[PDB]
């Protein structure tokens, strides 16, 4: 049924968001003096 697929896709996009935040934090951290 389609509703579980909707939930799975929503979960996937949420995970992508969560990963993007960490990637941005890491690349920002790599530039700092310390």
């Amino acid at each position: 049924e389609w509703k579980k697929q909707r939930k799975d896709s929503h979960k996937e996009v949420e995970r992508r968001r969560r990963e993007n935040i960490n990637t941005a934090i890491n690349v920002l951290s790599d530039l700092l003096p310390v």
């Binding site: 799975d8 969560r18 990963e19 960490n22 990637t23």
Partner: protein, 241 residues
Amino acid sequence: PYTWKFLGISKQLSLENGIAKLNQLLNLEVDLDIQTIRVPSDPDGGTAADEYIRYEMRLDISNLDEGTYSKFIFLGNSKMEVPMFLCYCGTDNRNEVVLQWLKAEYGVIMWPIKFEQKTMIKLADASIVHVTKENIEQITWFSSKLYFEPETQDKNLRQFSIEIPRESCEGLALGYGNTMHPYNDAIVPYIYNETGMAVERLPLTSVILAGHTKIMRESIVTSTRSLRNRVLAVVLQSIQF
């Protein structure tokens, strides 16, 4: 959350011939899907002996949880010396009932399955890879975390981990060049060069792809409700001798 457990099958039973006596034994009717797949389509993996036959069987009185959703998977191939294995998920004990029926019905003998460290690395490589509708391979990166647990005198070194974010994995894979199995191809040699550590030899306990799956000594834990085909093909190729 979706765990799994795998068993080996000593004979290429035709499960469809016997579905009814299972149904009356289980007091319900189970579905049975049939798929002839060509999973190792890459050229170095092969273009023959790819014709695995996959069966989806489910005990779903409902699908509110893994136990009710608990679905069996049989995948076999006639050219394979031991021809077929089995997979199932959840804590439901009806799984035990169907296993008992199988062994008593087809005269078949069954055993559980284990994984080697190299088997684990290959399985993790198989977990990330996806194929588009155009029959083209693609890769999705996850923050890998190798997790070991050695035995040493006086518990000198109990455990240690090697965490590798997405960016480092992708960078190592790109530095190695265009490849299909980055964990074996690039990451482990880099770890060995930087530390002299042989990940294959070391006592690996788990390989975790964050938010995607956890690969373990006795089981697979998966974010998705199901296992993509390369996982099952790797399992079957690992069953053998």
